[PDB]
Each structure stands twice: as structure tokens, then as C-alpha cells.
Amino acid sequence: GSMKIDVVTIFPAYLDPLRQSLPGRAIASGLVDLQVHDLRRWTYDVHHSVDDSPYGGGGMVMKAPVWGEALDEICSAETLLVVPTPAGSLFDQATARRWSAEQHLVFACGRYEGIDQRVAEDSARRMRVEEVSIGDYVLPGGESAAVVMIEAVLRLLTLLEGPSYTRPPSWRGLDVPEILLSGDHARIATWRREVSLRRTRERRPDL
Amino acid sequence: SMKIDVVTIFPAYLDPLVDLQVHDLRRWTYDVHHSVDDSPYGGGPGMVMKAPVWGEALDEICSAETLLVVPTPAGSLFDQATARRWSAEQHLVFACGRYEGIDQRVAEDSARRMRVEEVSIGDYVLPGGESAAVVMIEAVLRLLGPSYTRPPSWRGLDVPEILLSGDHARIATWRREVSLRRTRERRPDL
Numbered sequence A: 001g002s003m004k005i006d007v008v009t010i011f012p013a014y015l016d017p018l019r020q021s022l023p024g025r026a027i028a029s030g031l032v033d034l035q036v037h038d039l040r041r042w043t044y045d046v047h048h049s050v051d052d053s054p055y056g057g058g059g060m061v062m063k064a065p066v067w068g069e070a071l072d073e074i075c076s077a078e079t080l081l082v083v084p085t086p087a088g089s090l091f092d093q094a095t096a097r098r099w100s101a102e103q104h105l106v107f108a109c110g111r112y113e114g115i116d117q118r119v120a121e122d123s124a125r126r127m128r129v130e131e132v133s134i135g136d137y138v139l140p141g142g143e144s145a146a147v148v149m150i151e152a153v154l155r156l157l158t159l160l161e162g163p164s165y166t167r168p169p170s171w172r173g174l175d176v177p178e179i180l181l182s183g184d185h186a187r188i189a190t191w192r193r194e195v196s197l198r199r200t201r202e203r204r205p206d207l
Numbered sequence B: 001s002m003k004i005d006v007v008t009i010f011p012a013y014l015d016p017l018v019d020l021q022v023h024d025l026r027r028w029t030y031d032v033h034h035s036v037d038d039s040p041y042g043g044g045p046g047m048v049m050k051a052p053v054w055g056e057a058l059d060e061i062c063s064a065e066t067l068l069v070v071p072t073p074a075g076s077l078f079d080q081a082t083a084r085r086w087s088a089e090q091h092l093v094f095a096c097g098r099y100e101g102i103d104q105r106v107a108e109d110s111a112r113r114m115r116v117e118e119v120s121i122g123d124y125v126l127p128g129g130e131s132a133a134v135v136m137i138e139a140v141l142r143l144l145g146p147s148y149t150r151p152p153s154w155r156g157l158d159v160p161e162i163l164l165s166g167d168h169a170r171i172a173t174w175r176r177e178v179s180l181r182r183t184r185e186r187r188p189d190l
Helices: A012-021 A024-028 A064-074 A093-099 A118-126 A143-155 A185-203 B051-061 B080-086 B105-110 B130-141 B168-186
Strands: A003-009 A032-038 A080-090 A104-108 A128-133 B003-008 B019-024 B067-077 B091-095 B115-120
Touching (some): A080 B168, B003 B130
Parallel strands (some): A003 A032, B003 B019
16 A cells, blocks of 8 residues: 655656655555666676667667666566656556556656667566556656656646636636536536537647 | 746745756745735635735746746647747746646636747646746757667577677668567557
């Protein structure tokens, strides 16, 4: 019933705002345990080399040996290893709910052309592996995608939505819809479903 | 040079990130509690960010050439075409919402003097717009099949031999085949 999250990256400061944002008492009680690891800690050479030339022409690809050293130390059989990648299955709210029940999530953040495909293959012998994309757009690395996914999961532990309004009733000639000032909870609920439907058909005709 | 302004009650969340400036929305509050939110009309589970506070901020930051981006799960989907289109802008402003979001009249009033786009990075719910602004900005800034590298054999797994042949057309046809199986398995939505 606890959530342990490890993020492995060559830019560990990237996750500092997310870690500092977690409520102190969820961390102190051990209910959320977010740790960020510098992938370079598992290199051997003076250069702390994590990447190399792709086979078959290409940029750079992250090396499997360093990733294997890192994941051998961090993961166990219970781990769910998430590899943020544009070639992954789409992340959605159903995935966030599913991952919120997990005991250990590990986010392997790649840079450049991605991580050598053998990392996901070898890792799958000893843990679950999900290659996931947050959407059909290209990012420089997996870090911002890992922040999005961790945020969607943590929010659950710790038809498009319609418009929202607060004071004042009139503002720069724009008025709050009168139904919202009625106090009729069932009719407000009905109006809210209708505006959501109209907004969904206009902005997202796919679904 | 492109100007990017991000407006938020959590400026530190933009630290992981062309002239980029991050603004604390509370700077446009004048009450002792520095309030940005108030009760939703018609009730509901969360507070709504006030149009009086956002209007002051957008009057200060925006001009008629600004493209105002409002990250929201109710927006149109962000995609690579949007990132290419936004990379040619001179001024992008990201209005990051928290609580239930921003009073709808902020985007409506703003659209009278600037271009406004309400955008969602995907079909999932985040606690605020900050992490989505980071994703969209990264996808813009970088515009301004499986991969393998050495060694050839590792933990019993070998790199496909075709990749070491030097034949571009044969590598391309193998990459088309492997990319098609992957798309069928991972993207049924396509």
C-alpha cells in the first residue's frame, strides 16, 4: 500500500521541483518515496559515457551496459519499468489509475535517439516493462514526460470538462451564465453536461 | 528572437526549462492573503482562478502579437504540427491554471486583442498546467523503429545483422517492417 518511484536520468536536477512539491508528511510517512538517480553513477570511464553512434546510420543512442547496471541495482521482480518514448503506447487516465495501484515505478529517461532497445528486452526478463508516449509530439528527452506521468499518478493518491466561473458576475462585458447563479443543482448539472458535449464535439470530434 | 512568458502560482516548477521569463501570478494580487482563487459559481469540487487577477497579469505581459496558450484538459490536442506552427511565433504566453482552472472569461476577453489557444497535451488529468507548459515549450525549443548501439552482443541479445550491412534501402525496409508490427501492437487507436 505504498508508492516508491525511482527516476533514472542524466539530468537529475530536472526532477527537483517535483520532489520539493510533494507534501512533507506523505514523504515522512513513507507513503510516497520519490528518488532521482544520475545514470552517470553507473559508468566506468573518465568520460561517464552513456551514449554512442547508432548502428545503421542516424545522433546518439544510450548504451545498454550502463542501463543494465543501473536497473540491476534499482529494480526488483515487483517493479514496473516505464520507458517514456514517442514509440510507446499512449499514456491515458486509465493507465494513471492502473499505475496508482503499483508498489514500485521506475522511469528510465532517455535522451538523443533513445535507449538501446535491448535494455527494454533484457529488463522484461526480470520485471514488467511499459514503453509509453504522453502524446504525438517529439520531446528532447523523457524527463518532462516522466514528470507528467508521475503528476497524473500522484494526484490520484494525494467528455471534456466545461467552463468554470467565479466572482464577479460581470467582468469586461462578459457575464457568468445565469443558470450558475440559480441554486438549482439538477438543472446546473444538466447545463454542465450539455456545454461539455458541445465543447467535446467542437474541440475533439475523434472522441 | 522568440519571447516566452510563463505565468503560474508555482514558478519553481518551470526551473527544469529565446527569451524565457517565468512570472509569479501572486504579483498581480493586492490583498494581504495574495488570493488568486475564489468559489465556483454553481458549486463544484474546487476553487476557480479569478479573472480580475489574470486580467491584470495578461494586460501587463500580452500585446496584440502574443499567442496566449492556456493548458487545459478541455483544450484541443497538442501535436507536432502545433509545435512547428508555434516555433514561428515571436511571443508565446502560457497561462498555467491550478485548482479547477481559470475563469472562462479570461480566454474570452484575451481573444479580443490577441490569439488564444486552449490546449491539452493528452487525455489525462494533471494537478495544474505547469508540467504541460514544460512539455509544449520543450517540443517548440528543440525545433529552434528501435535503436541500437555498441556492443554488438549484450546479455544474450544481438543487434539485428541488417543494421551492420551498410545497405540503406535494406535497412529502411527492415525498419518499416519492425515499425509496423510495433504500431499494430502499441497503437490500436491509429
